[PDB]
Ligand binder design. Structure first.
Ligand SMILES: O=C(O)[C@@](O)(COP(=O)(O)O)[C@H](O)[C@H](O)COP(=O)(O)O
Ligand SMILES: O=C(O)[C@@](O)(COP(=O)(O)O)[C@H](O)[C@H](O)COP(=O)(O)O
Ligand SMILES: [Mg+2]
Ligand SMILES: [Mg+2]
Ligand SMILES: [Mg+2]
Lengths: 455, 455, 160
């Protein structure tokens, strides 16, 4: 029942646990359920169910087991804060290559503890991985750098990649789909499958891939510029993912390195991400996170935050992951989410609780998506501080009054406007496609630039 | 933007949508966020972001796209109820075998809509799958029937399988681990890996599997009875899952059909479950749901319920899945969760909103686990109504005062008591191991059977 | 896999779903790809089930992939015409295990959303248990049609 004696040691110093490099640290916001134990008792049981124990004493426990117990080393009831140290010996490793698996981390640190009857709620806000555990993770094998190279941009700070998502989300047959692709590529760089697009009966996979490949060739000939496409290869069946990935690369042929592979990593799971990561390490891995909001939303007090998800994604080997519009778009987000971008791109960054050294592990691109358009972009860039990233605007491009191509250029010009530090309204006077975005989305223009119709 | 005219048709009859067999129906408890649209406007946008649309109008939309829009066909603001019909054409299919993937169902029906800025929260409580879509799912290939056969029990209503989870959760080295296995098997049938047990540095995978195989043979020779084990093969890497499974089956040799494969389906994902399902269809697939509580908990108003999770698992092909203790154990659960058991075992069953015909798709066993012991079992069976299932008690067995073997027998005897309709306190007088469970967990005995000191 | 999985595809009750009307495409051999598919279309207008005659496969005058493509088209046209589901049992018998896989995989991919309308036929007696098991274990989700051509050499009462 009361396991604080075993699973709690508040005399442990976080600085020494870090310096020791033998523990994964996790920070939770936890509240005990009324009518059970106090905070430390609840936190201790939490640690027990997350490492070596259960809800009662067992005869099979020996001193060796006691050595690898997870320990509650810090608490603050006033702020409902709970910090637990997990010995890295606990986490599962592959038989085949001795490397780490994020599934084990998840199972221990936020698995069964999310169902405990004596806990009202508990959510992970940050975690620390020491070198000995960090180096055992795949990390990204492909980065934006490999996309910049294809575009002919500098491989360091190659700048903004103008992108879109094909809309309708579903319903376009193969050739109408490819036509939308061609149109946008006349003004933009990057196109992604909307997350559910795959092998619908009305838009067969192989026919769509073929039509898009033709569209890429036609757009590149016309513009003289390289174009990128991110194909969804998500599936339950590992071999379905391979079949899709291999067919795409063979079809695109000499444009194969223009291809990214998109995976719905949250609903399909870490296993799906890893399938793509290890089977196609030389293809940009586009981690789409649909479904994540069920736990990451601040409205939820369970599971883990978007910050945690993003940090794991970097370990998993994501080339890029959606990090949200940070309050500037249609999805839930806050300006402070800028810290998420910094954590996945830099070699050293601060989380809400832990500083993380990445030891040269490759960065993960912040992919910006969700109700963005030319008008909303300057404000977004101001908060983030840079535009070395991928941003897509589906409705923002194809909802442009003059069509996808004009939509594409409006996004390009919007970023050019911000980088030049110019006033958007004044800038618009000499950039029609961007100016026409005001008329495309007048409700947005009205609030963001009040007297824009005057000029 | 108001999209209700396109994405809402409340004149649609649910009975006609079902009878048509062309739609998946989903029932949500949704609440709009203040400062946006009303209920129907928000529900319409919800449907759009879950099917064919975005948050603005796009020129690329054609009449074919409109034909496959998901539609809000029923709402009840008073109970915050929202029902959406998805044309089955929307959902992705495998190129390789034309079969369905649950990842697609997840992405559309509970993906991006979980992050919408204009929605405060939305949770799926039930879904209906029509025949044309239902028959495209793998379904279970192995059932408890195949476990009953190995145990030498009747293949129809073969009864209760006495099980446990090895505790410590982590910390037992290979031989101490196997010794605990041997002890329990002297009185019980079934043993599972605790969910994180795999290839820890102090308990190497191949050494542990070898020792457990030996323990099985020794227990079967000693008792003259068949014994079962459920090995965790969860991993990020598909090929790690294969390598683990293949080694287990080869090692156990003539006891290979005594082996079940455990997969942490929620944290590892549908992809991992499907890996095991399709690679090892002749091995009982044990779906462990660690982490699920982050959304399924009633404290959460996002994601989906435990009912929904269990029903999806049946389609995915789980031979058994954890359904919880329904309020009788240590995890969150309700007596009403009995309905979850019925939905995954029967050919026809009622959900909270939809009746489901399974068309002879194999059942999924309810696996009962989480702070159970001999004392708590009679009440559990009374609420469920049968014992044709697997129940495990880790702490309940190894926490028995007289050891694992006695612990196992207490579980066996507890079910025999319920089966006989006898009074537990009286029954204990002629059953030592069961009687000793009272002394093992006196706090439970005091609460469940006041004035038991009769013995 | 059992008749139940065929009954379900046909929309029949999975319990006592009843009689499945079938035929074998005749000529046994000699129909080129499209004439083959035309006969398939004709029968399906009135029937449920069609099997390859046991030797039909990849003859020089009726190449495997061309024939499968034409039959898939016939299935789609017949189902569109009748509004009812149709089944086909393809012969994938071969000496080479990998030829059996290549045939099965191409068929399932070609038929796509009609993939669960497909059965795999194996000449189990002449090709042997090994051929039967190849299909059983590689394609457990496809109805396995055991054809026993040659069996009479021992099973006949004339034989002792
Ligand atoms: O389906 C969509 O809505 C999108 O394609 C955006 O389209 P629009 O540009 O037309 O809004 C993205 O999937 C979401 O942004 C995902 O959200 P997040 O990036 O936060 O994971
Ligand atoms: O780790 C554990 O706590 C258990 O092994 C139970 O051990 P005890 O028997 O010792 O309690 C199970 O994994 C949980 O019951 C899972 O929960 P659920 O079935 O609700 O998904
Ligand atoms: Mg999208
Ligand atoms: Mg467990
Ligand atoms: Mg014949």
């Amino acid at each position: 029942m009361d396991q604080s004696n075993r699973y709690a040691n508040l005399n442990l110093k976080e600085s020494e646990l870090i310096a020791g490099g033998r523990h994964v640290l996790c920070a939770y916001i936890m509240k005990p359920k009324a009518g059970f134990g106090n905070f430390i008792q609840t936190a201790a049981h939490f640690a027990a169910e997350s490492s070596t124990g259960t809800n009662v004493e067992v005869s099979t426990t020996d001193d060796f087991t006691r050595g690898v117990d997870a320990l509650v080393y810090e608490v603050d009831e006033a702020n409902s804060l709970m910090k637990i140290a997990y010995p890295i010996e606990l986490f599962d490793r592959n038989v085949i290559d001795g490397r780490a698996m994020i599934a084990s981390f998840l199972t221990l640190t936020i698995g069964n503890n999310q169902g405990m009857g004596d806990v009202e709620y508990a959510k992970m806000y940050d975690f620390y991985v020491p070198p000995a555990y960090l180096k055992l993770f795949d990390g990204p094998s492909t980065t934006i750098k490999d996309l910049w190279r294809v575009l002919g941009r500098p491989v360091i700070n190659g700048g903004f990649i103008v992108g879109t998502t094909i809309k309708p989300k579903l319903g376009l047959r193969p050739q109408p789909f490819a036509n939308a692709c061609y149109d946008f590529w006349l003004g933009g760089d990057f196109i992604k499958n909307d997350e559910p697009q795959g092998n619908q009966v009305f838009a067969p996979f192989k026919d769509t891939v073929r039509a898009v490949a033709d569209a890429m060739r036609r757009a590149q000939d016309k513009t003289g510029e390289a174009k990128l496409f991110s194909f969804n290869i998500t599936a339950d069946d590992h071999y379905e993912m391979l079949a899709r990935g291999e067919f795409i690369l063979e079809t695109f042929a000499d444009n194969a390195d223009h291809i990214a592979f998109l995976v719905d990593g949250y609903v399909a799971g870490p296993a799906a991400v890893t399938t793509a990561r290890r089977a196609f390490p030389k293809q940009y891995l586009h981690y789409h996170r649909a479904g994540h909001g069920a736990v990451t939303s601040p409205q939820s007090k369970r599971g883990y935050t978007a910050f945690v998800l993003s940090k794991m994604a970097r370990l998993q080997g994501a080339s890029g992951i959606h990090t949200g519009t940070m309050g500037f778009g249609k999805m839930e987000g806050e300006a402070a989410d800028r810290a998420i971008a910094y954590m996945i791109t830099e070699d050293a960054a601060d989380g809400p609780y832990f500083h993380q050294e990445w030891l040269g592990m490759n960065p993960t691109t912040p992919i910006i998506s969700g109700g963005m358009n030319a008008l909303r972009m300057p404000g977004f860039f101001d908060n983030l501080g840079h535009s070395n990233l991928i941003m897509t605007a589906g409705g923002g491009a194809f909802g442009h009054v003059d069509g996808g191509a004009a939509g594409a250029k409006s996004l390009r010009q919007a970023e050019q406007c911000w980088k030049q530090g110019a006033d958007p309204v004044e800038f618009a006077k000499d950039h029609r496609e961007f100016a026409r975005a005001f008329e495309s989305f007048p409700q947005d223009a009205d609030k963001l630039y009040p007297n824009w119709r005057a000029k």
